[PDB]
C-alpha cells in the first residue's frame, strides 16, 4: 500500500528552520494503468513545512514524462499521463523529495509537523498517507540589570552564534521564516533587539543534543542597553523539547548586565 517516509535515522526528529528534510513517497501503480488517463500525486504539507518542488525525483521515470506544479499550500502536484506508466503496471512507484521548515506562526514551535500525500488514478483517490512528524525548538531570553534582576532593559542587541572550545566558531544568518545558515562569516548576523520589556528570542532551532560534538548555542551581545557595559563573553543556552512553548516571554532566561560610566559630550 502507499507510504510516505521521513528518512531520518535518529530517535528525535528536530530540525532547524531551512534545514533539508528527506522524504520518500511510495505509491501503487494499478495493473490496469494503461487503460486510464492520468496518475496524480498531491503533496499537502502541514503548516510550517514547505516542500521543495525542484527536488522531486521519481525512480525509473525521466523528468520529461511528468509535470510538477507548485501549489498554494506549499505542496505540489505531480501529473503523469497514464501511458507513461505502462511499464510500472502492478508495481510501486518511488518518489523522493526534500522539504524544510519555515515558521510564519510561532505557535508551531515545539509542535509535530507531518507531511501528507495522496495518489489518485483518474478520479479515484487512494487513502492519504502521512510521514512521521518533525519538530523545531527555540529559546526565550530577558535582558535585565545584574544588581536588580526585576529591571528589564531596552536597546540591547544580541547575535545567535555557536561556540566550541572556548571560541565563537559559527555565526547564524537568517531567521525562522527564511531559514538559518551557520558559517564562519561574522557579517549579516541574525540579531535581535530588546524593547522596554527586555524580551527577545530565537525560534526555529534544532535541539542542542543534535549539534556537533562540543558545540553549544550562545547569544553574543553586540550593543549594550543605555547606561550599561557591553558583555565580554557570549551567553550559553540549551534548546530541548518544549523549551520554547512552555515559558511566557517574560520568564525567558535572564541575562545580567552591569552599569557603566558615561562620557562627556
Which parts of this chain interact with Na ion (CB under 5 A)? 25, 27, 93, 95, 114-115, 131, 134
For Cl ion, give the closer residue by CB, 102 or 194. Answer: 194
For Cl ion, give the closer residue by CB, 45 or 138. Answer: 138
Query: Cα 130 to chain center, whole Å?
Result: 18
Residue nearest to Na ion (CB): 95
Q: Using CB under 5 A as the criterion, which residues of the chain lie in contact with Cl ion when the complex forms? A: 192-193
Question: Which does residue 192 bind out of Cl ion, Na ion, none, counting CB within 5 to 8 angstroms by kind?
Answer: Cl ion
Question: Which does residue 193 bind out of Cl ion, Na ion, none, counting CB within 5 to 8 angstroms by kind?
Answer: Cl ion
For Cl ion, give the closer residue by CB, 105 or 209. Answer: 105
The two most distant CA atoms of the chain are separated, in Å, by 87
For Cl ion, give the closer residue by CB, 121 or 160. Answer: 160
Question: Which does residue 131 bind out of Cl ion, Na ion, none, counting CB within 5 to 8 angstroms by kind?
Answer: Na ion
Strands (E), the chain: 3-6, 21-28, 38-43, 49-58, 67-70, 76-81, 92-101, 116-121, 124-125, 129-130, 137-145, 148-152, 157-164, 167-175, 179-183, 191-193, 199-205, 216-223, 235-237, 253-257
What is d(CA 128, CA 42) in angstroms, rounded to the nearest whole number?
Answer: 9
Question: Which does residue 95 bind out of Na ion, Cl ion, none, counting CB within 5 to 8 angstroms by kind?
Answer: Na ion
Amino acid at each position: 500500500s502507499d507510504k510516505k517516509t521521513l528518512n531520518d535515522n535518529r530517535s528525535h526528529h528536530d530540525f532547524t528552520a531551512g534545514e533539508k528534510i528527506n522524504y520518500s513517497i511510495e505509491t501503487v501503480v494499478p495493473w490496469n494503468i494503461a487503460n486510464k488517463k492520468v496518475y496524480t500525486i498531491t503533496d499537502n504539507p502541514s503548516k510550517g513545512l514547505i516542500m521543495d518542488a525542484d527536488t522531486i525525483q521519481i525512480e525509473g521515470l525521466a523528468s520529461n514524462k511528468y509535470t510538477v506544479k507548485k501549489n498554494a499550500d506549499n505542496g505540489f502536484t505531480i501529473t503523469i499521463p497514464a501511458a507513461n506508466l505502462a511499464a510500472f503496471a502492478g508495481k510501486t512507484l518511488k518518489t523522493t523529495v526534500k522539504g524544510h521548515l519555515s515558521i510564519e506562526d510561532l505557535t508551531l514551535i515545539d509542535t509535530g509537523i507531518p507531511n501528507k500525500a495522496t495518489a489518485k488514478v483518474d478520479n479515484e483517490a487512494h487513502h492519504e498517507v502521512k510521514s512521521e512528524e518533525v519538530f523545531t525548538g527555540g529559546k526565550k531570553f530577558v535582558k535585565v540589570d545584574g544588581s536588580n534582576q526585576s529591571k528589564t532593559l531596552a536597546g540591547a542587541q544580541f547575535q545567535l552564534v555557536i561556540v566550541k572550545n572556548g571560541q565563537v566558531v559559527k555565526y547564524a544568518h537568517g531567521n525562522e521564516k527564511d531559514g538559518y545558515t551557520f558559517d564562519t562569516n561574522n557579517t549579516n548576523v541574525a540579531t535581535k533587539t530588546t524593547g522596554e520589556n527586555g524580551q527577545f528570542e530565537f525560534a526555529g532551532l534544532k535541539y542542542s543534543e543534535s549539534l556537533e560534538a562540543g558545540e553549544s548555542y550562545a547569544v553574543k551581545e553586540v550593543k549594550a542597553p543605555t547606561g550599561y557595559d557591553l558583555l565580554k563573553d557570549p551567553v550559553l543556552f540549551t534548546v530541548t523539547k518544549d523549551s520554547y512553548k512552555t515559558v511566557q516571554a517574560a520568564d525567558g532566561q535572564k541575562i545580567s548586565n552591569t552599569k557603566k560610566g558615561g562620557f562627556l559630550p
